């Protein structure tokens, strides 16, 4: 269980996170769509990004609740959208930035149109649904112990089907996308050895270097929010279940810091991305 001061704390900055990141991301979107013609496949992807984040964002009003009475009160069909939309931002985002770094591998190597990165946007969802729905038929509001509680229901014997749903979840929501990012920018750094001002104009090689920065960091700050809560629930499958209400502290704060993540987004913008630092201020 949890203390009532750690609740309002938690709740606390799950409003902060919700106010600060629906206002900033609406307001990215709002800038790529109806204040410019910013769209860049990178800018593309970013919007992907602020979309999902959005709608995580949404849902951490109805966790907050659950959270300060300890159960579900909204039935089954929230329930269902709640799970549903964070699985969806987490295979979305994963995705989104492995197609953003391999865009940046083919701007550096190949020296890229909005509505190509639009389409892998559109395949990106697609893959989100392959595993979006699924969980969205089976996450359920579940009265566990006289209680309700809001969870995807393991098929049984749950001891099998567990460890390969949390490895398989971990492998091909986190892992391989991170490999691929990993792969892009390893062979992005054996590219540039030796190379001053190559890949023509040396002005529009700084915006390259920029852009590649921003998506370098972007990750990093999304694989550092995220890699405590995948290992913590890789853990949870496997039957490894906290006891203690320390423990319980630690992992609500481990997931709130991935919806930190998700507030966190826009702000990473205005500081590395020229464009939209000039653009948040007019
Ligand atoms: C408070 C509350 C109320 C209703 C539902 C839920 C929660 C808690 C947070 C959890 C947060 N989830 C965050 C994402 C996490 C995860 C996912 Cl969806 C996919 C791959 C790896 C990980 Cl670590 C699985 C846990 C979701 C749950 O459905
Ligand atoms: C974001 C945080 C939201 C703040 C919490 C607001 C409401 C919690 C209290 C509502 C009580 C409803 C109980 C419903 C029920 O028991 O079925
Ligand atoms: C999801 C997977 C999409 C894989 C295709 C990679 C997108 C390349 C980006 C681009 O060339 O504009
Ligand atoms: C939810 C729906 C996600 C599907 C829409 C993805 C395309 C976004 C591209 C765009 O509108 O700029
Ligand atoms: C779009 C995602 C909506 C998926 C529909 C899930 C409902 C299935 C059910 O409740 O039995």
Same mark, same amino acid.
């Given at each position: 269980?949890? /203390?009532?001061? =750690?609740?309002?704390?938690?709740? &606390?900055?799950? $409003?902060? *996170?919700?106010?600060?990141? =629906?206002?900033?991301?609406?307001? *990215?979107? +709002? *800038? @790529?769509?109806?204040?410019?013609?910013?769209?860049?496949?990178? %800018?593309?992807?970013?919007?992907? =990004?602020? =979309?999902? #984040?959005?709608?995580?964002?949404?849902?951490? /009003?109805?966790?907050?609740?659950?959270? $300060?009475?300890?159960?579900? /009160?909204? &039935? %089954?069909? $929230?329930?269902?959208?709640?799970?549903?939309? #964070?699985?969806? %931002?987490?295979?979305? !985002?994963?995705?989104?930035?492995?197609?953003? !770094? *391999?865009?940046? +591998?083919?701007? @550096?190597?190949h020296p890229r149109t909005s509505s190509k990165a639009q389409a892998v946007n559109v395949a990106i969802w697609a893959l989100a649904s392959v595993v979006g729905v699924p969980v969205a038929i089976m996450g359920s509001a579940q009265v566990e112990d006289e209680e309700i509680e809001c969870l995807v229901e393991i098929p049984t014997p749950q001891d099998y089907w567990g460890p390969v749903f949390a490895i398989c979840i971990f492998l091909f929501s986190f892992i391989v996308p991170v490999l691929v990012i990993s792969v892009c920018y390893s062979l992005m750094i054996r590219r540039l050895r030796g190379v001053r001002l190559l890949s023509g104009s040396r002005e529009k090689d700084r915006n390259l270097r920029r852009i590649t920065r921003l998506v370098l960091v972007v990750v990093a700050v999304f694989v550092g929010c995220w890699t405590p809560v995948q290992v913590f629930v890789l853990a949870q499958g496997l039957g490894v279940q906290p006891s203690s209400e320390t423990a319980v502290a630690i992992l609500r704060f481990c997931t709130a810091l991935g919806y930190v993540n998700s507030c966190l987004n826009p702000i990473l913008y205005a500081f590395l991305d020229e464009n939209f630092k000039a653009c948040f201020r007019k």
């Amino acid at each position: 269980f949890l /203390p009532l001061g =750690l609740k309002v704390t938690i709740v &606390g900055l799950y $409003l902060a *996170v919700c106010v600060g990141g =629906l206002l900033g991301n609406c307001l *990215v979107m +709002y *800038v @790529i769509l109806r204040h410019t013609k910013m769209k860049t496949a990178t %800018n593309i992807y970013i919007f992907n =990004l602020a =979309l999902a #984040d959005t709608l995580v964002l949404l849902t951490l /009003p109805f966790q907050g609740t659950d959270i $300060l009475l300890g159960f579900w /009160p909204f &039935g %089954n069909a $929230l329930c269902k959208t709640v799970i549903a939309i #964070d699985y969806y %931002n987490m295979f979305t !985002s994963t995705f989104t930035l492995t197609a953003m !770094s *391999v865009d940046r +591998y083919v701007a @550096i190597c190949h020296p890229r149109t909005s509505s190509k990165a639009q389409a892998v946007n559109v395949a990106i969802w697609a893959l989100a649904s392959v595993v979006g729905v699924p969980v969205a038929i089976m996450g359920s509001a579940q009265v566990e112990d006289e209680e309700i509680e809001c969870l995807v229901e393991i098929p049984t014997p749950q001891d099998y089907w567990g460890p390969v749903f949390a490895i398989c979840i971990f492998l091909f929501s986190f892992i391989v996308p991170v490999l691929v990012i990993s792969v892009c920018y390893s062979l992005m750094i054996r590219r540039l050895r030796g190379v001053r001002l190559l890949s023509g104009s040396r002005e529009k090689d700084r915006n390259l270097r920029r852009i590649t920065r921003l998506v370098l960091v972007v990750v990093a700050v999304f694989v550092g929010c995220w890699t405590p809560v995948q290992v913590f629930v890789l853990a949870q499958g496997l039957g490894v279940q906290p006891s203690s209400e320390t423990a319980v502290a630690i992992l609500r704060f481990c997931t709130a810091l991935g919806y930190v993540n998700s507030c966190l987004n826009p702000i990473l913008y205005a500081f590395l991305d020229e464009n939209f630092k000039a653009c948040f201020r007019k």
